[PDB]
């Protein structure tokens, strides 16, 4: 038993539900919440931008931090960070950016990402601001994901089609 509410269990492993992923991380405070990272950690908008605000900015502080020592992530990569008042940990995943003509191959190594933590809080990868197909990334995340996500859909009438159109 853990602390999530009101998801709809779309398989054994993957859960969804409407929620804005700010909000959702604030009141569960999940072991890992997932950020819709890019390569250089930058959290300007989308998830990462709201996620990075919420906590005032710190998320960005200790992002430019790793990226002076580490270099940027690969696409399809993730690190661990601090979850800040958010989580105890943020795996920072970055999906392929479809309007940088970057590989849609590269959603399922994304995905993996989430195989090395038992139970996760995370949005659907490339989606939004990344251009993909969300229906695409449902579908990837449930044939690649083994571990327990929980995944925040902050579109309503997205929300409804991704649960309408499963299969
Ligand atoms: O709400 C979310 O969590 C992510 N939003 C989207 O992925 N929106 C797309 C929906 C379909 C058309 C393009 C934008």
Same mark, same amino acid.
């Given at each position: =038993? ?9 398989? *054994?492993? +993957? ?8 909000? /959702? ?8 919440? +997932?950020?819709?990272? &890019? ?8 998830? $990462?931008?709201?996620? &990075? #605000? ?7 502080? /200790? %992002?430019? *931090?790793?990226?002076?020592? &580490? ?8 690190? =661990? ?5 958010? $989580? ?20 399922? %190594? $994304? ?7 038992? +139970? ?16 695409? %990334? ?10 327990? +996500? ?10 409804? #089609? ?6």
């Amino acid at each position: =038993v853990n602390s999530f509410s009101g998801y709809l269990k779309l398989t *054994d492993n +993957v859960y969804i539900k409407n929620a804005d992923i700010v909000e /959702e991380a604030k009141k569960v405070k999940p072991t890992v919440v +997932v950020n819709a990272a &890019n390569v250089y950690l930058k959290h300007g908008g989308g998830v $990462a931008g709201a996620l &990075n #605000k919420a906590t005032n900015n710190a998320m960005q502080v /200790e %992002s430019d *931090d790793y990226i002076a020592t &580490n270099g940027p992530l690969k696409v399809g990569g993730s690190c =661990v960070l601090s979850g800040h008042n958010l $989580a105890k940990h943020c795996l920072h995943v970055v999906g392929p950016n479809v309007n940088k003509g970057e590989d849609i191959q590269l959603l399922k %190594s $994304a995905y993996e990402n989430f195989n090395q933590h038992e +139970v996760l809080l995370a949005p659907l990868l490339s989606a939004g601001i990344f251009g993909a197909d969300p229906i695409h %990334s449902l579908r990837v995340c449930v044939d690649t994901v083994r571990t327990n +996500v929980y995944l925040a859909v902050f579109d309503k009438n997205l929300y409804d #089609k991704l649960v309408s159109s499963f299969l």
